[PDB]
Amino acid sequence: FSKYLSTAPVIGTLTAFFLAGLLIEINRFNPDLLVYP
Amino acid sequence: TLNLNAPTPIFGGSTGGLLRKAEVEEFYSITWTGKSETVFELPTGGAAIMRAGENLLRLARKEQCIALGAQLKDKFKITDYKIYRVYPSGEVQFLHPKDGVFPEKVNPGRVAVGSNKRRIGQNPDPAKLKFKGQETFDS
Amino acid sequence: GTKFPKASQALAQDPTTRRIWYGIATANDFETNDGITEENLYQKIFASHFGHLAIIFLWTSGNLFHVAWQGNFEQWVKDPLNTRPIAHAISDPHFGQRAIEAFSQAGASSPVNISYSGVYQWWYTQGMRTNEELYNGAIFLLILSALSLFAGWLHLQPKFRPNLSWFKNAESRLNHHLGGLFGTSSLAWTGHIVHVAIPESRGQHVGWDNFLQVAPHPAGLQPFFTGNWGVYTENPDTANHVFGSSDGAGTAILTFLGGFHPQTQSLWLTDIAHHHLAIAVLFIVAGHMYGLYDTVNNSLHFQLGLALAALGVITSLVAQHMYSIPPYAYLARDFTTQAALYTHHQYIAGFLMVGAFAHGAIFLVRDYDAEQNKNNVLARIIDHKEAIISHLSWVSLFLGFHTLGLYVHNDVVQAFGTPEKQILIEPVFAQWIQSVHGKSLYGFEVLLNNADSITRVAPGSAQPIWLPGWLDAINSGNNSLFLTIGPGDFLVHHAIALGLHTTTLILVKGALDARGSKLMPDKKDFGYSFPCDGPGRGGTCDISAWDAFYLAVFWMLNTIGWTTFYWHWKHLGVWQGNVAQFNESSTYLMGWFRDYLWLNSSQLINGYNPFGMNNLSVWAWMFLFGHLIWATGFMFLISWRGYWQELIETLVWAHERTPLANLVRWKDKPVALSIVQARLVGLAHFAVGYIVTYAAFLIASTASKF
Amino acid sequence: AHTVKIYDTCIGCTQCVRACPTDVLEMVPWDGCRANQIASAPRTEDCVGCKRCESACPTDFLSIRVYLGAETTRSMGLGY
Amino acid sequence: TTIKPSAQVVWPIVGQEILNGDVGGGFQGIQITSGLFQMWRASGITTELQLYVTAIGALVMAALMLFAGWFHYHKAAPKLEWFQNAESMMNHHLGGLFGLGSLSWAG
Amino acid sequence: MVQRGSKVRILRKESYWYQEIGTVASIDQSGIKYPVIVRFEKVNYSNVNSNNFSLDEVVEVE
Amino acid sequence: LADGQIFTALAVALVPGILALRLALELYK
Amino acid sequence: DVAGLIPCSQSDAFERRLKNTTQRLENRLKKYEPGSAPAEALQKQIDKTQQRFDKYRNSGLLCGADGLPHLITDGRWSHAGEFTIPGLLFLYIAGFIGWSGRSYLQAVAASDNSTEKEIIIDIPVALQSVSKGFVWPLAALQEFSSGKLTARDEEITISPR
Amino acid sequence: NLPSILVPMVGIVLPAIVMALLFVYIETDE
Ligand code: CLA
Ligand code: CLA
């Protein structure tokens, strides 16, 4: 099953789930970031 | 020869077969011996029943006679089918096998028609053969 | 079998319907005719050109004749601001009584069409005032067409057939065309302006009946030879001057005022005269001057592709400069024909530019001889062809991902009630150029905005006198001379850039892979246009160079569409003096959908309805007409040959087996359209529909509100 | 009719010949070795241009090539 | 009549919490057009405790179907002739699935 | 002279593996034209890994 | 315009009408 | 003031974007109970607008006639935070994704079955490549200077000319 | 007045003539 997790769709989804949820948490605590202050 | 007439299989049907092209120019006939009384699909619709025969079927195109002739060698293993093309309103008798041997098998006595003594990258430019009667692919 | 088509015996032996279609398509493709020698080929081209010229002459004779006979030119000349120019009368028997009362407009007693070609404003400036001067133009062009038609027939006769060497005598042609065709014609056009155009603009009538008596300048032609050229820059027309009368009229014939006449909101006639005289001199001097260049000379497709590219570039130029620098009196005031003129010439330019690359690809498959073309610019571009295409691919992707991304970003952020979160980039490089040209709005204050800068002062010879007239117009908010731009203009300009790069990409990849690719190494052996290479090797649909042009026609329309969509919406606010609508709504796409398409289609879509009909019923019908033929093209583009060929077979069967119909027979066997044919037929429907839909909307939306 | 040319890179695999739906091709004795076989096109007047032959050729870039030409009743595949 | 049928409360992030509109009463969410509110009222459901156990009852039915799919392929797979019994399958779905399903729902 | 198992680079411009590296499967020991059978790691559009070339279309990159 | 100027213009247009037919049947041959 | 743009702290239109936004929500708060759950949902929504606008005044953004923040990309160092500072922030992350997958495919191709290792991701080899991806502006410079960043055009597959 | 005569000639009559002229020209043969 850990060999199955290295296959491209499931390893391509959970990092797409991770890279999304990074930006979801960043925009949650730090809202409305147009520019670098 | 064609052995016309020969018994057409017990079919009775097919709107999709042998219209006015056949009576003006160039229809086709395929003649085989079926060593059973089995049902077989046609190029038009599907059934007839193969006779013991001397079986014969008049078709519209040479395409349909080989497409039926491939079926008799695949499903029923009868490889003695003999396609033809008719007299006065047709053109040339005994289309296949032209040398008596199936074309996938080599036979001595045949001549190489349409051969090119090069590759395709060695073919000249079309600008080199502009305004001439020569063709870019012909040798 | 049959005689038609004459040009191709192999089509002539085809017993099916394909023969007629292909015989129409392969007809003016003279190169592929039977037995056509090089010498015979060129003479046919030349003669075909005379026929085309005559048609052009007859066309503009037909516009003159119909205006003089059924227009309102004489009524228009009296008050250009309020008179609607009439194109021609309407004679459509299918009209009813209420429809005749709706199209009996512009003060006419018959149904007529309001003209939008701008011919009234062009003919006026040249000096025409009455219908009888218009009619005199129509008869003269009839003769010139008959002079063109006779000449084509003449240069086909044995004793007058030009030799092959004459057609390929390149150096002689450049000298004579730049000198004669361009130079002396421009010089002659300067003659018309100082002797007719300028006098008629000052209330003095000059025609053929008196031009040899009256002088264009009080004491002209003694200062010209004695070198005192400065006398022609005497007292110009005052700002009070009313075009077409002697009140405030001057006597200058060659000037350098700059800017636009304050009343007509267009260039000064005297200013246009000096321009052509100068241009004339440039061409006459350049006309006394006269490997890669030999392969230009032996290929008619190479020349045509460059001539299409040269025409395509300057066709766009005509559109850009006519809306911002109006050259015809009262053309800036009629907003609908200014909308029509920009759109018309921009679409033509898109076709020419796409066509330029099309004939370039034809050259590479049929005329490019790779053995006689080594180590030059041509054979070097093919050598790193994959680099060029890959980079063109990158820029398209780069531009596209980000411009669409910002639009989608803005759309979401505006949809959620937070417009302040949008990403709006100011067009600072552009706004710099406007300040370089003199627009003092952004305050960048360098070159022609800086009052002490060398470009405005010019201490070498004290030249800079074009500056007063130019600066007044570019700073007054009453024209289109360097319109104010903002965030909306930034995004669209990159969308247009995206369109120009992607359209060029399709055309460049198609041309550079025309001779061959890995999927089809011997592509050149099959010619410019062929169906494909079968389902083998993975599949080969749309592999011919012709198909690449075909895909690029979709991208150019999209590109020219985004161009024309932008120009129209921006000017719409500008013409209504409420620029705020475009500036704030154009930065997100819902604004282009709600405030541009939906908003301006209110009246157009109501051209006729259950309560009546107005003077927009034609445009409303055409609008629907365009949608139907656009959509009809999708049928040929999505459904392919096989479905149809098998369907047609059941129809052949059905016809032959039905009594009273069996009795009659087709001479040509019915068959489905070809693979290449369908692409062409689908694209032709699509693109006719694309243009006809936008033309109906553009004209009706602007004419409704002005 | 369509023209079907056979180039000298043929390895006598017979795949093209056995792909043709109208029996346009056959194997004939080669004289370059008197051992192997090359494809031939003696009945091109019956070629419909389906290109099934080329799709069966194993060689990296075709030894048999079909260049579509003048169409006829036979070449258009009409039963009418 | 006045209160619009709504579910799917949207999280307070970048601005999609404007989708939680004034839908009726003291609630903010997405007005649904699925007919579930009129279907549960016809079924008789008056409290969310009855909606809760039906969500639990659907999850155990999901696991029962997922266990039956594992069991009837990996562990206990029927033969071909068990599938070709069309007359018994027509008998059972008409009486059991369609008859008792509409009998007990009438109950 | 190219032996079996040697790495070559293809000079045939119409090939899919033109200017690419492949290894020889075998050499036919007769006078048959194009005897050099090269096997490649990349497949072409017909998904085949082998082709026949001549000695003039292969080199001795090694 | 006048009514006689119209029929004058259709009288002139036969000269391109014949010379187009003279050119097009010459371009055909 | 680079294109006629007043700053957003002095823009009178940017203040009126605040006034109608909180008026559209205080009218949306007028119908609810003061202690309810949609009451604190709109009060947290109102205070998100107050942290939106007071962030944009002090950031030094440029507001036009409509009252929206504009970005000035000609890059000046007074306006570097609009495009220049997030531009260098993008390129490192984008080059880290680029140099990882490029070095991953070079490590995979010199193996037995490189084709299956594009389906299955070798977690040792992938974590070896993200170690090589953090140093991409230093690693690509020595890869280019030593000459193994590029191939010559006689080693690449190329169409017939 | 002349509009009422001419627009059914080139609208109906003259296309009926040239379609008749082109159709016999297509289906002639040697
Ligand atoms: C029932 C549908 C219908 C029909 C048959 C017509 C017919 C006509 N209308 Mg129209 N019209 C209609 C609906 C219709 N209308 C509707 C619903 C409206 C909105 C209310 C209008 C509004 C309107 C306006 C404003 C005008 C017309 C005019 C005309 C006339 C054009 C005369 C002409 O020069 O044709 C010749 C046709 C052409 C030159 C275009 C055809 C080009 C072909 C198809 C392209 C292919 C060429 C190719 C080589 C094919 C071979 C051809 C060859 C065999 C001859 C013609 C009588 C005009 C008029 O009055 O003229 C006197 C005009 O100004 N109509
Ligand atoms: C003056 C410039 C010029 C010249 C001399 C030529 C000349 C030629 N072109 Mg080129 N070309 C040009 C510009 C030019 N073209 C432009 C602007 C484009 C982009 C559109 C192209 C794109 C192009 C391609 C792709 C091809 C050519 C080809 C040709 C050759 C044969 C044309 C032919 O017989 O088609 C027959 C003519 C037709 C089929 C015309 C019917 C289609 C029209 C558009 C229908 C119009 C629709 C309808 C009437 C509208 C009615 C309105 C509606 C509301 C009812 C000939 C050498 C062909 C060739 O093979 O060259 C060797 C070829 O494949 N051209």
Ligand code: CLA
């Ligand atoms: C493709 C997927 C799909 C989805 C997501 C939906 C979604 C929905 N359906 Mg629909 N449905 C679908 C396909 C789908 N339907 C198809 C193909 C049919 C025809 C068989 C139906 C027949 C149907 C009915 C009769 C009803 C719904 C209802 C609903 C809504 C409430 C959900 C619910 O649990 O009701 C649960 C279902 C019911 C309460 C009614 C079930 C009664 C039927 C007659 C039982 C039939 C079962 C039987 C095995 C199927 C016939 C087999 C026969 C041909 C041999 C929801 C919007 C309900 C609705 O409108 O809500 C307001 C509703 O009454 N659907």
Ligand code: CLA
């Ligand atoms: C562009 C050229 C053109 C012109 C000038 C017209 C003109 C007319 N059409 Mg239209 N029509 C056209 C193209 C044209 N059509 C096209 C392309 C279509 C297909 C979209 C139509 C579809 C259409 C329909 C369905 C109808 C018309 C009708 C009419 C007539 C309405 C008024 C009327 O009935 O007078 C009253 C006068 C008469 C009824 C008699 C007039 C003369 C008749 C037609 C011929 C008399 C025989 C004559 C001796 C010899 C025949 C002439 C022929 C050989 C050239 C009007 C004459 C209507 C009509 O009445 O049809 C006849 C009608 O119902 N049209």
Ligand SMILES: CC1=C(/C=C/C(C)=C/C=C/C(C)=C\C=C\C=C(C)\C=C\C=C(C)\C=C\C2=C(C)CCCC2(C)C)C(C)(C)CCC1
């Ligand atoms: C600054 C600035 C600017 C400008 C810009 C510019 C102008 C630029 C240019 C640029 C350019 C003109 C560039 C060029 C380039 C080229 C080349 C040639 C490249 C190459 C590359 C490479 C080779 C890559 C590699 C890689 C890496 C590194 C990593 C990842 C992976 C890869 C592989 C991708 C602006 C104004 C906007 C803004 C402000 C700032």
Ligand code: SF4
């Ligand atoms: S028939 Fe269609 S799918 Fe087949 S090769 Fe031709 S274009 Fe491609």
